[PDB]
Design a protein around this ligand. Sequence first.
Ligand SMILES: [Zn+2]
Ligand SMILES: [Zn+2]
Lengths: 87, 36, 71, 91, 77, 31, 176, 112
Amino acid sequence: MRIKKKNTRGNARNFITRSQAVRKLQVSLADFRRLCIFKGIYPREPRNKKKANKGSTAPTTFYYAKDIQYLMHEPVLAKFREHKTFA
Amino acid sequence: IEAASLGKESLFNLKTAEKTGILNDLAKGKKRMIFT
Amino acid sequence: AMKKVEDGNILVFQVSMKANKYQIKKAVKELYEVDVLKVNTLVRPNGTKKAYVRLTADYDALDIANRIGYI
Amino acid sequence: AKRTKKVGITGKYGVRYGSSLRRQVKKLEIQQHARYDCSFCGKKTVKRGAAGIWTCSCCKKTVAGGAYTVSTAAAATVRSTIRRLREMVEA
Amino acid sequence: AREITDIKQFLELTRRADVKTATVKINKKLNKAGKPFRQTKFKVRGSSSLYTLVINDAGKAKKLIQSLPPTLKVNRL
Amino acid sequence: SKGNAFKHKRALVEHIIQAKADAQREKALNE
Amino acid sequence: GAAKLRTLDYAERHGYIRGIVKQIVHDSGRGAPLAKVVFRDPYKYRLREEIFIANEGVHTGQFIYAGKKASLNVGNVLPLGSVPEGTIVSNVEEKPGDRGALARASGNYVIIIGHNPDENKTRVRLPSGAKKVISSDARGVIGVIAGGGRVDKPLLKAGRAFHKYRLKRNSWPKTR
Amino acid sequence: AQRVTFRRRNPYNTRSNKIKVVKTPGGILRAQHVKKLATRPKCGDCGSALQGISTLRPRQYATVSKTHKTVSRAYGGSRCANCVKERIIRAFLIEEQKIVKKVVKEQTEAAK
RNA sequence: AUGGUGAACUAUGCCUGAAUAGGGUGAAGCCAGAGGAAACUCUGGUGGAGGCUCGUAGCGGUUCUGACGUGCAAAUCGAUC
RNA sequence: GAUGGGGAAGCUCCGUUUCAAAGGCCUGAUUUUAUGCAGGCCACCAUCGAAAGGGAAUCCGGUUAAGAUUCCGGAACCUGGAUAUGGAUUCUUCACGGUAACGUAACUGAAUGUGGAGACGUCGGCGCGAGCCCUGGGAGGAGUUAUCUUUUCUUCUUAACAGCUUAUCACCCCGGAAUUGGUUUAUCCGGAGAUGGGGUCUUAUGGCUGGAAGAGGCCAGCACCUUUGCUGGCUCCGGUGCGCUUGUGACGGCCCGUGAAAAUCCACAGGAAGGAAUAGUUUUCAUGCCAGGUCGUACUGAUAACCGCAGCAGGUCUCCAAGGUGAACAGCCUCUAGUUGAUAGAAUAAUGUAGAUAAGGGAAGUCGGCAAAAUAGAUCCGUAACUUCGGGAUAAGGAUUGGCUCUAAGGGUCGGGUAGUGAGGGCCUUGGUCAGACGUAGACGGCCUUGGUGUCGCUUGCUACAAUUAACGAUCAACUUAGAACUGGUACGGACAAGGGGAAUCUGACUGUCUAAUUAAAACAUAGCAUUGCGAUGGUCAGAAAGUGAUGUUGACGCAAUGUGAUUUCGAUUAACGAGAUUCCCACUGUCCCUAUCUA
Ligand SMILES: [Zn+2]
Ligand SMILES: [Zn+2]
């Protein structure tokens, strides 16, 4: 086993920032906030925020990566896309 | 000699300070400005 | 192999060529209800794969070998 | 005193290559392996690193110059004429 | 392997949570071409390091052996 | 000594002794 | 890296940009030594290296000025129109934008003959002896290429010729 | 008289396959492969080996603490303190020249 | 003629590695000393240069009424250079 | 070597970053238009190619019929991750100390910029370290003992890793140098600050300790059908060097030759920010927790393991490398290790092959001194013509060499005092007070001396010739040189090892080079020499022609083609050198007169 990279597992993989989540979901910020409120997704706080955000101390919103992955399956997102096409 | 002359233009110039007119004022440190 | 079983608390198995040490350890644990300390592996010249599986002190490889039925 | 009457630094070449060729090589070889003064710090601490590159042992300054001597006469005259005509440009 | 000098540090280390086994080793040596004297090495097995404390006084070694924790398992020689 | 004046340690010692004597005599005669 | 002047821009066209000589280094297959000159990039906050051909007298740590209004000192590069009569330059641009074509070998230079009224033209004597007229905006480094007198030393040895010509493209030993 | 062998499978006297001969507690001679010797880090301006900095192979610096790799000064782990002193003096005199030259320029354009 | 296959030998360029006793000779530079108005000359050292040299390992081959011819060798060994 | 493009009837070709929409990242309630994403930031092109280049980290002991840095035991380390405690830090929020070089257990950090390491030729001597070699004492075991030998041989070891400490170079502070001084084997260094005193740094490297004696080694005493174990000892202290192998440091020489890249790791500059008071921070300090996949791993590596159709007297890369002789990795003999393999036996004519000897003569032999012989190491003396002054040269030519007993010479480390005052360190002989747990005994130890080993002395402050006789003494060690007696030789480089030399002529300047297997030069190349062309709208080429490719990372001290080939002197001449050619000379000889004998 070769040497692993130093910002890929642990807090870095456990948490995802809001902009990364919005990009991954391929939706707007308004849609992301609406979906999080509908599904009970809430911001979390890493114990090691520098490790979660590449040493940055800037104030960021963190979500669980698995929660965002689960949100990716909600049919309400497909309903949002259908509404956009209708508009 | 020409290398030293090349430096003189950019770094502090006693002749130019003397040419400025005010000498004892500069010795007391009367002119101050901040750049950058 | 049986000298290893009796002395070094090591079970010797012929395993699948496609199986890695994780799978060998998991399979032995599931099949024989024993804890595994380490797995060393080699590919024999006849084309097969051989595993030395060292159990923890809690378990006796000789007793497990008798339970399997080779002695 | 003098281990060699005439041949000098060309004594490493023995009896080879011909007298005239050895003589021609001699002057340039003496120039090349010599230790020159430093114009920047005023010490005889300058030696050639490669043909055209001359480094001072003290003050660690590297200068560009001739192939076998620190300065060429052509370079000296070009330097002086540049000085003269830039002075006349000022005047 | 690390040599530890302070007796207080040795006792705190022997009370450390990861420590389970220690060993008492007896050596016969000479002090400055002197009489054959006793040397007691206390070797506490940590997770990373074996810590050795060398005592050249037999009575002090015995009293430290008394001072050792009960749960720690000691191997003599 | 770098110039190979002295054949060995005894030669250097004796030459030093003689040179110190010469210096003493020269200083006394200039006195 | 190829030995080329700085890319033409507004600073060198009108004012001057100051770089510093970092090292004077040996290039395989080339008689003349090369000079590494570091400039400040006018747009982006980063240092840019350049590989000039060292003239005689250029030294490490020296300030080299490039532009229309730079001092007429050895090492400084100038448009040919900014220099007076009779000057001596090296690495002369044939035409604006080629980054140096004339008098690049060791101990070689180009003299200035005279300027032109009708447009910006100047005439020059090349090392061979030809007299050529180039655009007066073409740049050149003040001085003479370093490493002069190199051809005066006999090689004396097939082995020295071997070591010289294995780095070049010339076929050695020669046939036919 | 005891003769030894290389212990890795490289059989050649390469730069990275250098051995030493060591006597073991078993009383036999044996080859011991030695790693390449580390190089002292160099000053960013002059190139001299800066002092107070540990001498390790490049990967090993990731293991030691900060104190091993720096000194307590500006440019501590990069420049050699004579270069730092000259840098400070040059910056100060550049600022002073700027002040004097600006005053001269303003007065000149007043009287011109 | 058409269409294919070869640089595992051999030839050459390039990249990255590796190998090469012990002696003779004694260049420049340097130290001390002596004669010459100077130039210079001379003595004793020091130093350790050279597509120098004797000569191993190595590389190659001027060769032999040597062993030899279906020989051990489809090219060898010894000697020699 | 794809993609984007462009060619090609086409199989496919060109090219390797372009004439490509080649993809990542930050912020947001972007305040109204009420369920449709807005505002910004940054630039570069795949991939393959090294089991000898670069590169994270493991050692010792033991174990098998066959495994081994992989198993077993013990002891470590690396990488990634989650995290807690202690430490540190903070109410002067993100540490103090040092004049300084810099120090330390820590002592926050995003974009962006920059620096270091990775990362580098060859040769020479000098210094240092490691293994080996040699050697002394002592504790064991073995051999020899006809006579002698406090004797000959052998064991006496210490890994990775960790803590403390350890250095040339380099740098800092004080100070200001000519009567210049310091200083290397090697001549360099100092007003850009020498000598001197005091410091700081890298840790190659060594030392002490932990690992670790419990391991390993060498011995003694024990049982007994055994598939078997046990008990005691010792495992210590030195020396040496132009030694050998190797690593390394600081230097010097050489180049018209200046002697990889990338991954990767660290640091600096900067400061988006975040962070504490009945509470925070710091995972570059310590400790603690978890995990490490895939494939190779047996054996040979060659006169039996590969290639030559073989189980061929051939070839094929590399590592380790004991004692003597000796200049020596030569030849010869020996130790450790290995082998004793090659179809055998009996005879001994000639001939053959290999190796030798030989009266007298000495090239008379033969196309032709072919082949053999003779010479040969080292020390001292001595050395011609010619010469490009460097050579020729070991020119030529002489003397010497054993053994033994002596003589002379060549070194290192430590040594300054009592005449004199008074204190300081340690088991303080004996003598004095306080005063230590365990199994009649009771150490060590926390306190002191004017004493002791005119009141010795181990220490500083100092007057007094500090030494112008340390011009000498105590102690330690290596092998070299020179010379003189004596002495045996039919011999002294006693085997081995090891130039024949000279006088003229022809030829090529030289070092070099190709004909693998009948042709190694007078031919090829070569530095030098001269001429000719080319300034980019160019030259030379490749190509039938081209949006023609290269030279080209190129620019007249360059590129290229020609012809001659060193150099000097007057087409001739020329030193040095040659597995080049020719004629002689000395020496030598079975070439010969003329054969004969011996060994395998
Ligand atoms: Zn200088
Ligand atoms: Zn610096």
